Design a protein around this ligand. Sequence first.
Ligand SMILES: [Mg+2]
Ligand SMILES: [Mn+2]
Ligand SMILES: [Mn+2]
Ligand SMILES: [Mn+2]
Ligand SMILES: [Mn+2]
Lengths: 297, 265
Amino acid sequence: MSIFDKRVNYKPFEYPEVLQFTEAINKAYWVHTEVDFTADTQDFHAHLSLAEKTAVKNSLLAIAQIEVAVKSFWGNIYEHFPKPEFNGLGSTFAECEFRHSEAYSRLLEVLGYNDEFEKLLDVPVIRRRVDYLSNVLKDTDNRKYMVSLILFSILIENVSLFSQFAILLSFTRFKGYMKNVSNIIAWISIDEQIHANGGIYIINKIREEFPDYFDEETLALVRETVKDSIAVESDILDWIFEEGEIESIKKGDLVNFMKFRIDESLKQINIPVIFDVKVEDYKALAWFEEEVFANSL
Amino acid sequence: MSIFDKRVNYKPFEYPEVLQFTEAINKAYWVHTEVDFTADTQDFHAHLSLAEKTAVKNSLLAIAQIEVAVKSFWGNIYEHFPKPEFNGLGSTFAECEFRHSEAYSRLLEVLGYNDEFEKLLDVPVIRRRVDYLSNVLKSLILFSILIENVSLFSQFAILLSFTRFKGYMKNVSNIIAWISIDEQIHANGGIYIINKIRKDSIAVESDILDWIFEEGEIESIKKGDLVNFMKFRIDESLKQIIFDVKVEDYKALAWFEEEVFANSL
Ligand SMILES: [Mg+2]
Ligand SMILES: [Mn+2]
Ligand SMILES: [Mn+2]
Ligand SMILES: [Mn+2]
Ligand SMILES: [Mn+2]
């Protein structure tokens, strides 16, 4: 049988590597109620400029536009991979997403941005992403579902949030502010890396069992659709920094950071690199990995 | 706009009490990898009789028949109650059921009963409950009293009895106590949706009790008290939403709520 065929017996697991992703979530388990944002409200109110206040506010709004919602992809991966492993993997990932949405919802409530979130569809750059995301995940056919799994793992889990993650973390590393928010973002970015790595694993298993599925047309659509994401997210970075340039982080460094992460995801699934970022370009955000590790414990 | 209509916006929560059950699950979070069953294997092999081994074996097998499987009920409650709270409640309970199925799978492996679980459908007593739960559940009312309660709680008491009276299987009792706390939250979560809405099971479960003690009854627990303890938990859950038990009939199994807390921490 294949990965798309239903197996009734619980164990032995046909894909026991699922446990490596679920155990990783279990070991990193966290809830936002372990975090109090009182000190972050005071640094935000007193020690942040308007350009920095807008950078944090539009960052969290852009993340919550995708994350604060009913995300049903992972919770329903058993419908396409009818294995007891992937039901456990999806349930573990779906519960993680509910913890994330509650963490983002609390951030918007504590900082007083619930009103802007309900009217976030009044921003043009947001609807352009909603329209873009409303063409990259429309097959949420096993082969049109797998390319949707590709575009879900490279975007929703790996690069459509991480540029905003780095903006929030930059205030803690370079300014020492927003340390509790950076605590939550660090824990989330670890969960999101486990989600993306789990998607890469499933994609490679489909390639290990169905190598014909990765034909020339599918690779051409993935690389084309990925190139459109950066044109969309570069305009979002413009809207995030709409009140001006800030000292903690630069937009040009975020774009190369976004390009580097995409190529790293394409490498792990044997898809040709698109941008080939230079060392002197992506090392500007090389601090992101160690900053996630610092704000983790 | 009722509970079966899809409210698109995430917050505010129409049913904010959902967070009471998810946080209780979050606070009681646990995995079977925290527990080592080496001390339980030595007591099982040396200090338990054949009737006690069979009681523990068939207890675990009876629980595993329902819990070691793909349980798509809670994971799909958003398709019937399209609210962001219930998708969060369903996902929280669904993940918890995977931690349970993995814990039971480890118990079957640690006690060496994997081949017995493969051939569990050879048991005519197991086939009767499979066919009973088949036409039934063809739902939430039945699901929260059956799967989420005393279709497991009687077998939970059989396992916990060895620790209270004989001091054995303390690590298994750790797993079973944590599971019973999670199951109690799952039942209260189903009852919540049920009062926000607002006989055949006992004969089948008594046959399973006959099969659990097929090699003879044991010292730590008796079948007759289990049926009354079963009869208590059924009506006491019906009060929240038929087998009136006298209290000196059921308080023979009232240490359960006490032994669960002693093995929780
Ligand atoms: Mg589902
Ligand atoms: Mn999420
Ligand atoms: Mn995710
Ligand atoms: Mn369960
Ligand atoms: Mn349950």
